[PDB]
């Protein structure tokens, strides 16, 4: 539920402290935590909103020049003077122009020419600062079990549903509890402050389009700019790079503006996150969080219910998720009240031997009516198998066939781990971090190597990186030392970072 | 450039490919891609739409 | 016939996609019409049979 079809989900099967299991949530996917005797919980981060940001250093990307003026000095005089020069709303440029006996000034030296033009801005972009406060993560929980078929994607009814919860986390209240009626309460302890390394990201708006932008890229953009919150008529600094004082045949100056500078900023913003904004709040579209899950107060609703003695039917038979798990929807005909559903995966129906794993929980049917509907998902074995539901001589059975082999599963697991590391750094070492001594040392050495690799490299983007990857591959192949091992490892790191895509 | 009335279509996990009737017009930009569907969107199957 | 997929995708003919609604549109416009050139700016269009 909430996770079935996502196609980017991973299971955090296992809990070796009897207690909390660390977990890192991303915008793309969702995490299904399954324990020994505790119901399978599905968690997903939904939206991260930022509100009441402060404003810093807005830039002007479309200039306009109001009125030109110019003055020439007849070479042996003082300097070309305009009273406008002292007004800081005007652009003034001084050059030398040929003069004499044609223009009425008797001498033939070079003279001074000053041209000034009024600078008036047009629509323009604002950067804003994301402080650690005022940042709110919304986390949705849901629970497997008696859920209907549709309830995986329904919109509202959270407070009424009793199996789904919504948790808001802010650095003012990092730790929260989700109260699931009848299942107990699941505790989330999260570190919001170190989520996506904010305090390096400005929120940038141009015209109803908003992005995240690195502080350095923003502070290194050449355009007219004035610091602080705007109002009224501003005082534009660096009133150039939008005004071009081109020269005529050594006798004039013409002042032109560079038009609208907006597509250049759009293509300059290559590799920055998008964002959408409604009202004052802006909801980011990508991030990640690290929440440990105190599952010490999760109970099991189903236990101490007698088995159901009726017949079951397949409404839509089975679906197969991308990851191989099978989702089944069963309809119950009898009326025994709340009772367990006996379900398993078997081969050799003569002797039903449990093969595979049933990843839902103790399946239950909550309602007590004529016909009820429930959904459960189970993890089949790689061979051909039968889905068995029911007890005796009425047990509905289905045939189900899964393609992969255990080696393929291990290979895909290592690939998923590699992608997660490439995306998250050491916080990937914090993914299922029940917490030992090997894991902590792994995280430590990964922190050190990551700091070094980010300081040396990490100023490249998919082509400088691929080129230096090939070059280090060669130089490591043919340098004849232990530096061969050094350079081949550097090549592996860089090229994997590239071809993750 | 300026843009106008967006539209979209999607046709399942195991059917053909989406086709808008506004693809037979030389004034519309159209892009075709894959989306995750199944058990929460309306079509029972779980591949890529 | 029963045809193996990857033979019903690597076939070079004008291909629609799925829903037949009104006046069809084929996204190929190639491999079934031969634009044979003449000489001295003469151009002719034929179909393959």
């Amino acid at each position, epitope marked *: 539920i909430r996770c079935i079809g996502v196609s980017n989900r991973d299971f955090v099967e296992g809990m070796s402290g009897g207690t909390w299991v660390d977990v890192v949530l991303e915008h793309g996917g969702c995490v299904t935590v399954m324990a020994q005797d505790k119901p399978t919980v599905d968690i997903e981060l939904v939206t991260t909103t930022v509100s009441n940001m402060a404003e810093v250093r807005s830039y002007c990307y479309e200039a306009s020049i109001s009125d030109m003026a110019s003055d020439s000095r007849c070479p042996t005089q003082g300097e070309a003077y305009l009273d406008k020069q002292s007004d800081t709303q005007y652009v003034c440029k001084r050059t030398l122009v040929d003069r004499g006996w044609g223009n009425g000034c008797g001498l033939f030296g070079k003279g001074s020419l000053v041209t000034c033009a009024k600078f008036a801005c047009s629509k323009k972009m604002t950067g804003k600062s994301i402080q650690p406060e005022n940042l709110e993560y919304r986390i949705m929980l849901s629970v497997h079990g008696s859920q209907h078929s549709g309830m995986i994607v329904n919109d509202t009814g959270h407070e009424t549903d009793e199996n789904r919860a919504k948790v808001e986390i802010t650095p003012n209240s990092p730790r929260a509890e989700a109260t699931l009626g009848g299942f107990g309460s699941l505790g989330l302890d999260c570190e919001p402050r170190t989520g996506l390394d904010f305090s390096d990201l400005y929120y940038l708006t141009m015209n109803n389009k908003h992005w995240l932008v690195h502080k350095e890229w923003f502070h290194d953009i050449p355009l007219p700019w004035h610091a602080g919150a705007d109002t009224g008529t501003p005082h534009w600094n660096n009133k150039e790079a939008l005004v071009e004082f081109k020269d005529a045949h050594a006798k004039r100056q013409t002042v032109v503006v560079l038009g609208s500078q907006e597509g250049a900023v759009h293509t300059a913003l290559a590799g920055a996150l998008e964002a959408e904004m409604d009202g004052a709040k802006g909801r980011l579209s990508s991030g990640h969080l690290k929440c440990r899950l105190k599952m010490d107060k999760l109970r099991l609703k189903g236990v101490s219910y007698s088995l159901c003695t009726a017949a079951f039917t397949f409404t839509k038979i089975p679906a197969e998720t991308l990851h191989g798990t099978v989702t089944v929807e069963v309809q119950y005909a009898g009326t025994d009240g709340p009772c367990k559903v006996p379900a398993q995966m078997a081969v050799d129906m003569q002797t039903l031997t449990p093969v595979g794993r049933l990843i839902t929980a103790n399946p239950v049917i909550t309602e007590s009516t004529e016909n009820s509907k429930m959904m459960l998902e189970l993890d089949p074995p790689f061979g051909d198998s039968y889905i068995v539901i029911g007890v005796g001589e009425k047990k509905i059975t289905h045939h189900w066939h899964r393609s992969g082999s255990t080696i393929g599963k291990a290979f895909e697991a290592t690939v998923r781990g590699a992608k997660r590391m490439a995306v998250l750094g050491d916080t990937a070492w914090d993914f299922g971090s029940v917490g030992g001594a090997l894991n902590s040392l792994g995280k430590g050495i990964h922190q050190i190597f990551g700091a070094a690799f980010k300081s040396l490299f990490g100023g490249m983007s998919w082509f400088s990186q691929i080129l230096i990857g090939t070059l280090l591959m060669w130089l490591g192949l043919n340098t004849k030392n232990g530096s061969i091992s050094l350079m081949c490892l550097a090549l592996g790191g860089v090229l994997i970072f590239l071809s993750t895509a | 450039a300026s843009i106008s009335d*967006m539209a979209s279509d999607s046709r399942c996990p195991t059917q053909g490919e989406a086709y808008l009737d506004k693809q037979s017009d030389t004034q519309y930009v159209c892009k075709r891609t894959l989306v995750d569907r199944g058990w929460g969107n309306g079509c029972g199957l779980f591949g890529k739409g | 016939w029963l045809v193996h997929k990857e033979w019903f995708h690597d076939i070079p003919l004008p291909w629609h996609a799925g829903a037949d609604t009104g006046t069809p549109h084929w996204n190929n416009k190639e491999a079934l019409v031969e634009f044979k050139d003449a000489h001295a700016k003469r151009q002719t269009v034929v179909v393959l049979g």
Partner: antibody
Amino acid sequence: EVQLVESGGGLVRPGGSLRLSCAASGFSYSNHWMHWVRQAPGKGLVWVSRINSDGSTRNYADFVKGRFTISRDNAENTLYLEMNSLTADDTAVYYCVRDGVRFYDSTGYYPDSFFKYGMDVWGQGTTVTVS
Amino acid sequence: VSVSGSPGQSITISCTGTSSNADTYNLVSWYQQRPGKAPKLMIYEGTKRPSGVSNRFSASKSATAASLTISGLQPEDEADYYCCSYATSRTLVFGGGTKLT
């Protein structure tokens, strides 16, 4: 129960513009498809247009060659139908319709081909007179 | 266009589209409009009847037409009946309507 209320219908000259509105309450408006249908005086029902929850997909009948523009605001539970270059053939009662059958798909976004439907929740309709 | 009936009898209104994929009638919906009243739907998905609509109304469908059957006619039943379905994948179209007296 859900109640739909039309507004904005009135007399206008041929070639004029007119903006019809529909107010909804009592259900998850942000998740249901919405339809505009019309019925000429003494005539039958004629489907006009439909839109999704978010406003991404908009479908219009053949008789509207871009004259109509359907839109909505989920936060305000409001539906709008802009109309330009009115003629006499469009003088009729316009009914605002809720689409709950799609709400199979509780999102109301994905516009599958030939998806199941049936229109039971209608507004009272507003009269437009092009005279 | 119209059908006449006596109290207690059964009447069938047919809906036919010409050469439409031989699929369409699976999704035909039937709507009732009493004189001066807002239209009410009696049938959707071809044969499924909503809750609250009387069991008096029934529906059937084939590869060539759809039929709406009202048994035990009552004076209330006199109204205009309209069938609707897809013209193409993105469209909807209402039938010519039948006035049942």
